[PDB]
């Protein structure tokens, strides 16, 4: 069922990094790893978590629609996309913190709790409300990553198929005539280690390969590596061209 | 509101070929095309059809949703892609015409006449073949009406489930990077002439959506890949796509 592939370390060992990428193959119901250790291994989701937040709101009315705008509260921040309006779709793209941080404060930690639960999302632990995502207690390996994204897939997570839709919908990040990418990067790095996150799925015709990586990333230089590592395995995998 | 701009005529010129480009700027309420007249000219929809086909499937359970396969007759046909089993997904990417006339035949000319009344989709007529009409009969559609439908598909406003819509515009998406995502349908019109190539759907931006639709003189299938080249290069030039 599942199996390890350490030809893949290679991939993280020509860019003098760390890490693993999980694989999972729905139509065989097979899953590979490059490290089965650090795939179970739990971090901090960081931006990942945007995608349960983004359900989460989306179910309860704190989002009418990803049409609807987030009026940027006119403080400029580091990020200089977060420094202008967004929806849904841009706060997804641009990982924009203060407008889930927002979602997180009308959310509320009780309904938060009750929500992530249902969804056995990673250690069901809010150790903070606003914050608790980016430097508190929630933790999320790989391989449950993976196993959260395919409830998504197939609209099996407690919430309406409407939520679901959505932020798959919010999720694109790329597509031509060979794949369908539908994705979330994360970078935490409020506690060590400093991790670059991946997760999301790959749509070909016939089949669809779920994907969940992180790598360990000590300097910002190497964020590139997240989708570069994650592209050159399912290249070799010849998943795609 | 509307607005000609005769320069993107040198792109069709170009290639030696005529035909029209309609923009719609959604959030300044402007339209933009080479041919005003053109934009206006109604044609056999072709495969653009699997939009409306798509959408009035979905609201009556012809499917059940965007997974549900749609197992090959087993009869040859000239398309390689065509040739294997398919979903919403595969149906609308590879323009896969015995899917959608086994939809129309399920759908049925009543059903089917009254939701392109609803939808105010081109010119209501589907008078031909339940199966067929779409290719070689009645319905006729000019790029302003396509438009016109598409922002109703946008905002979700056609009279049919969100649900529905949402799943055909998902069905739509074609291409997506971190600059645009394009949803669109190809269409190509042969049985009856004139000839003609369709590509329509829209552009999203991070703030704005480019609705187009676009249709050529296609005498020989060698132009086809114009439909998409020409409206990325008037893309380009408006500076809406890098
Ligand atoms: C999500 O992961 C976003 N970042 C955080 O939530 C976050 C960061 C951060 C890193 C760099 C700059 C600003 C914040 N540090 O800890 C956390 C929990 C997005 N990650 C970055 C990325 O490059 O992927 C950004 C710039 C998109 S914000
Ligand atoms: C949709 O328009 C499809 N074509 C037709 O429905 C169609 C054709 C046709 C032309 C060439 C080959 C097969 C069918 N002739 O009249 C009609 C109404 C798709 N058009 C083609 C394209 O290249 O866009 C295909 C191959 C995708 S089928
Ligand atoms: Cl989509």
Redesign the interface.
Known sequence: EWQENKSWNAHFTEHKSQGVVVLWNENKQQGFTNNLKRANQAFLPASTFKIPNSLIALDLGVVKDEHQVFKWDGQTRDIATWNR?HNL??AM?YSVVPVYQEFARQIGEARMSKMLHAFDYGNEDISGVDSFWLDGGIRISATEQISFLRKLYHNKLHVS??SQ??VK?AM??????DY?IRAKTGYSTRIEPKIGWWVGWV?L??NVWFFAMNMDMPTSDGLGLRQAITKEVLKQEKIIP
């Open positions: 309006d779709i841009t793209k198929e409407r839709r959505i919908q694109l990040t790329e597509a031509n005539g369908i749509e015709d016939d």
